[PDB]
Design a protein around this ligand. Structure first.
Ligand SMILES: *[C@@H]1O[C@H](CO[C@@H]2O[C@@H](C)[C@@H](O)[C@@H](O)[C@@H]2O)[C@@H](O[C@@H]2O[C@H](CO)[C@@H](O[C@@H]3O[C@H](CO)[C@@H](O)[C@H](O)[C@@H]3O)[C@H](O)[C@H]2NC(C)=O)[C@H](O)[C@H]1NC(C)=O
Ligand SMILES: *[C@@H]1O[C@H](CO)[C@@H](O[C@@H]2O[C@H](CO)[C@@H](O)[C@H](O)[C@H]2NC(C)=O)[C@H](O)[C@H]1NC(C)=O
Ligand SMILES: *[C@@H]1O[C@H](CO)[C@@H](O)[C@H](O)[C@H]1NC(C)=O
Ligand SMILES: *[C@@H]1O[C@H](CO)[C@@H](O)[C@H](O)[C@H]1NC(C)=O
Ligand SMILES: *[C@@H]1O[C@H](CO)[C@@H](O)[C@H](O)[C@H]1NC(C)=O
Ligand SMILES: *[C@@H]1O[C@H](CO)[C@@H](O)[C@H](O)[C@H]1NC(C)=O
Ligand SMILES: *[C@@H]1O[C@H](CO)[C@@H](O)[C@H](O)[C@H]1NC(C)=O
Lengths: 434, 435
């Protein structure tokens, strides 16, 4: 007569769920009473719950309420089962499979622990993405939908784009659980460069029984400025350089939205000019875009001949319209007319006489006006007004020079020089006193 | 009798290499029978004996003389019998029985009562490396005002000895860092989530956040970084003042001052006008700004006053909520009257088309109004007034030309050049005829 308990074992069940205890025996003769018993809470004696008579597979319940227990003996498979239908906390006891020959008791037992049902909680949903702004760079993306801290594990995470349910490229890692029996699910939606850089409305919808309405997170992305074609602007040569240095410098300003170094190439009449292709580092701007500038110097004769100079940067517009600098048709040029006058008439004094040079009837409007006292260039007192357009289609301007009366009444020569595109040199107009 | 029970609804699980501690409790009150530990070898159905205790003795008598991997212990006081396996192997996965009998050997000792269980031996999970992901709300310059929550996720790693830490601008941050309890999937891989809550102020500032994840499967810590610039939505509106145009002052005889407020928030901007510091009633007005090519929004408010009030020297100030406190670049006042210079006019002929020139010089400030009249009729065609240019003398000067057909110049008409300036109470005239 011995009641063993394997105290290094236990059976755990959630409150309300059924328990299925089972014992295997090695007897080859069905000649003994088989019993299922349990030790009630607060005592130390094994109260009998049910038994089978030797040779009979019919359970003989003696205690409890016939409905809470379900027994089953099968001498073929050598099994004796006892099931508790709806586990309660009071069921947490020691349970024994017993064998005896008359009501010499040999029993083998274990313990039963009854855990509570975890409190149902609602999932916290978080939708995350890489930088989803306008300045978003080119590349593939991975949208993330995290749902944490919920019970039970019957959560559904779905993806939508522009109202349409998306199924491809949706990967959800295996379900997860912490020490507090709260679950965590992670869904990911992988997006190609094309779709990611377009304006779209992504949505993650999470459905859970603790929620009457699904939790919907939204990400509304505008079209990416990284797919905008680089803008090229041309800077024509300055007349100042054309008359002074007699070089001609053309400029090419390329504005991208990618900070990558920009490589510029120059073509003359379609053919690339050797030794002129050059790469420069762009410069960040106000809107976030980057801008670089390339310069190309040519001879004055080549520029005035009518050569078409084209600027090309990789991935630009095919129309060479806003990318080409060429001198205008020669029959459209108008030579500037110069008209000088003097205003601001013992004299002596610190009086100032002002000389005016009217430059009119020229095309295009780029003009260079300078003043010279004999054979010396003047910088002080010179005021060249901006060029204004004519109803005749040409342009006109005025240039003033304030000189002390000491130099005008002495008898110096005052020259107004005008350099223009339609001139092979500089057109002079002299003005002396007497 | 004689029965070998096994509670088949129970089992014991151990990781390979770790020790196993089996234990049985008995209800016998006399230490008068042999207690033994046995196990069923893999591939049979008979209980092979492993060790036994003589009745009354707590000293183990192992069946093989040497307890190598096994270590037994009986204590009849507490009625306990324990058996420990040092490093569980896969062959240790068997059925184990604590047995009681009154006589050993002799085949069928008809007093064999045994209680048994099973033992499962699991392998150590393969160590994997954590995938680290740092996430945040929109972290651009135009990021909206509000509190933020940065997230550092580390998934798919083993074992669970991972460390997630946060840094701001190189300084380790500890406050407001919350990590939910560690988590585990069916493949015994762990997942940890750390969160850093940030107040509106700190989030809207330029900062360098960092999440550092350390794990034994990593030779070098994984560091994720998020560099946010200062937000332009907390930028104070910039106010620019527009003084009245002399054109309006001479024609309409009012004086309209302008206030251009530039924010980065599209909210309607409320303007208030003060005269000599005191607010002018009826002038507070809120209007909706207009976005420009920069992301900012800009609005303009106008205030009309009498010419006498403006020219007297009253200081007019423009105020917008949450703007600069210094009223210097927010105030419009006419300059001291002794700094004004009246414009000097000099007419000439330079030119069929004859062109007349009117040189207006030595005036301050530079706002000037030039008009032409043929006797008593204002001219609009052929008039060209050049922009005002500064003098080394400190004043300003400009030219206005008029191209007229030779018929009117050679006929003998009066050609008047009118000039209105701030230093003039009317219009200064200069006539030029042929004769
Ligand atoms: C130049 O500015 C003066 C100053 O007037 C002030 O600014 C104006 C833009 C308006 O907002 C005015 O309300 C404000 O006071 C203007 O003088 C104003 O002229 C009008 C029209 O003549 C006057 O209204 C009339 O006034 C008389 C007498 O007060 C009443 O009988 C009429 O029923 C009617 O209200 C107004 O009073 C007067 N403001 C004064 C004197 O302070 C002036 O019109 C303006 N110039 C132009 C060309 O607009
Ligand atoms: C950005 O939001 C913060 C947080 O709301 C604002 O700071 C304070 O916010 C409280 C509560 O909403 C308000 O009552 C206070 O007026 C705010 N005070 C200060 C001193 O900031 C903050 O003002 C907001 N910033 C902008 C530019 O709107
Ligand atoms: C966009 O980025 C992907 C890599 O993510 C690359 O394959 C693709 O070529 C990029 N697009 C362009 C136009 O360079
Ligand atoms: C023009 O440009 C060339 C090439 O840079 C330079 O060597 C030369 O001095 C310049 N000469 C004139 C006349 O412009
Ligand atoms: C040049 O710019 C104008 C105006 O922006 C545009 O109409 C024209 O198509 C452009 N030419 C090109 C891109 O070749
Ligand atoms: C006013 O504006 C000027 C513009 O350059 C600036 O330099 C100056 O500091 C401003 N003064 C203020 C805000 O008091
Ligand atoms: C021009 O006006 C003046 C007065 O300013 C007058 O004496 C003269 O006769 C006028 N000439 C003509 C042609 O009307």
């Amino acid at each position: 007569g011995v009641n063993f308990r394997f105290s290094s074992t236990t059976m755990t069940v959630t409150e309300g769920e059924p328990v299925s205890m089972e014992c295997r025996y090695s007897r080859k003769t069905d000649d003994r009473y088989l019993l299922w018993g349990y030790v009630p809470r607060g005592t130390s004696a094994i109260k009998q719950l049910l038994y089978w008579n030797p040779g009979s597979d019919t359970p003989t319940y003696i205690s409890g309420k016939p409905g809470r227990y379900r027994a089953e003996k099968n001498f073929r498979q050598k099994v004796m089962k006892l099931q508790i239908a709806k586990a309660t906390q009071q069921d947490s006891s020691r349970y024994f499979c017993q064998l005896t020959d008359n009501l010499d008791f040999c029993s083998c037992g274990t313990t039963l622990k009854v855990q509570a049902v975890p409190p149902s909680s609602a999932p916290l949903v978080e939708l995350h993405s890489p930088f989803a702004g306008q300045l978003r760079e080119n590349g593939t993306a991975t949208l993330l939908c995290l749902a944490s801290g919920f019970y039970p594990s019957n959560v559904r995470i779905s993806w939508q784009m522009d109202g349409r349910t998306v199924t491809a490229r949706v990967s959800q890692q295996p379900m997860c659980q912490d020490e507090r029996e709260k679950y965590t699910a992670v869904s990911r939606l992988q997006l190609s460069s094309s779709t990611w850089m377009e304006a779209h409305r992504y949505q993650c919808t999470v459905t859970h029984p603790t929620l009457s309405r699904p939790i919907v997170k939204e990400l509304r992305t505008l079209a990416s400025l990284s797919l905008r074609r680089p803008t090229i602007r041309m800077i024509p040569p300055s007349i100042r350089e054309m008359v002074t240095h007699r070089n001609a410098t053309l400029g090419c300003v390329a504005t991208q939205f990618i900070p990558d170094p920009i490589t510029f190439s120059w073509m003359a009449q379609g053919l690339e000019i050797p030794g002129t292709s050059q790469t420069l580092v762009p410069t960040a701007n106000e809107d976030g875009s980057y801008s670089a500038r390339s310069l190309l110097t040519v001879a004055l004769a080549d520029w005035k001949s009518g050569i078409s100079y084209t600027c090309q940067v990789p991935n630009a517009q095919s129309d060479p319209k806003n990318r080409t600098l060429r001198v205008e048709d020669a029959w459209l040029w108008k030579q500037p007319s110069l008209r000088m006058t003097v205003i601001g008439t013992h004299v002596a004094d610190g009086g100032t006489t002002t000389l005016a040079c009217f430059v009119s009837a020229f095309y295009p409007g780029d003009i260079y006006v300078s003043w010279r006292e004999q054979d010396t260039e003047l910088s002080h007192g010179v005021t060249t007004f901006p060029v204004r357009p004519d109803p005749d289609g040409t342009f006109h301007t005025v240039s003033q020079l304030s000189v002390p009366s000491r130099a005008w009444h002495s008898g110096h020569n005052f020259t107004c020089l005008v350099g223009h595109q339609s001139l092979n040199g500089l057109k002079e107009a002299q003005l002396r006193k007497d």
